[PDB]
Amino acid sequence: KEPKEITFLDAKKSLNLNIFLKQFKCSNEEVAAMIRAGDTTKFDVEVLKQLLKLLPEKHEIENLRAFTEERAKLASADHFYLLLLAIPCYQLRIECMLLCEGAAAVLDMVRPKAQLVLAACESLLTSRQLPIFCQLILRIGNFLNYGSHTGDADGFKISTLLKLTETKSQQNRVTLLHHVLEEAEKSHPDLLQLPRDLEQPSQAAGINLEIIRSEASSNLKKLLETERKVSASVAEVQEQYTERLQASISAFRALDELFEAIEQKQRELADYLCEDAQQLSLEDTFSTMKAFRDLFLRALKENKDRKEQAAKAERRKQQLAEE
């Protein structure tokens, strides 16, 4: 029978470790070898999170080191912790594998989005059809506000583009933006190539850049602390992990250079819109231009449906007149 498993743990933690161990579909010696070799193929964020959440405790390590009987009498959990205690700097190796996989995940997460945000700022500073379209909106608004204090102006802010769909006609179906695009479909079609410049401003950030920047800075700080602990550790851990740490710190330093470039382009976009930089001129401008591009394409689609319905109504009227 042998029920005396001499397990120093309780039931729940040994239960969760027996849940955790059985998904590897192999012996715990292979698990201890993969910890010692630093192999990150089978070790994603969640597995190493569960492994750090099922760490051995101080009295558990003391009872394992005071165990003087036969090691086959132990359970698989206590034998796995003895294999884990056999690895020198095992928690350091687990933290290196977790931080390397998490650093690769956060870098592949943030860096194309940060390149999208930088390309969005570069296309918002330099846009081709945007001054001609803003001059047309300015001339139409100066005709519309003739005789009021808002009229006879030489410009407007970027929040006016959100307010274009607020003004509607007598029918309350064709807006100001819909009428301007119905006129621009006939006269100046190059303004319909406005989203091709705004396609890198399309989809915005969609995120808070301070959240990913604080996560990137905290990950870089954790990588620096980890590289300092590996530099205090043995040379096997150094030859295992120092090149990966150096590549991760170098890529996050390139990410911080990219974030400083986004700050410089944010100040340039604040000076572009003639607004102070103390207000949010970064995420509000991305959300404003994303909503402007979505309303622009929706005005194109609704004017297309309006012209198709008018042509189908003309065809139905001609077919009723012929019959």
Binding interface with another protein (CB under 8 A): 5, 11-12, 14-16, 18-20, 22-24, 45-47, 50, 75, 105, 109, 113, 166, 172, 206-208, 211, 315-316, 319-320, 323
Name the residue among 124, 130, 115 with its Cα closest to residue 191. Answer: 130
272 alpha carbon, distance to own chain's centre? 26
Give the contacts of 41 (CB within 8 A, at least 6 positions apart). Answer: none
Our separate counts of H helices and E strands in the chain read: 12, 0
Is the CB of 209 or the CB of 230 nearer to another protein? 209
Is the CB of 18 or the CB of 309 nearer to another protein? 18
Amino acid at residue number 97: M
Is the CB of 170 or the CB of 187 nearer to another protein? 170
Is the CB of 168 or the CB of 306 nearer to another protein? 168
Closest separation in Å from C-beta 234 to another protein: 32
**What Å distances lie between residue 25 and 19, 28, 97, 124, 177, CA to CA?**
11, 9, 20, 53, 62
Closest separation in Å from C-beta 218 to another protein: 15
Is the CB of 238 or the CB of 287 nearer to another protein? 287
Amino acid at residue number 184: A
Closest separation in Å from C-beta 307 to another protein: 17
Closest separation in Å from C-beta 206 to another protein: 4
Give the contacts of 249 (CB within 8 A, at least 6 positions apart). Answer: 220, 223, 224, 227
Closest separation in Å from C-beta 7 to another protein: 8
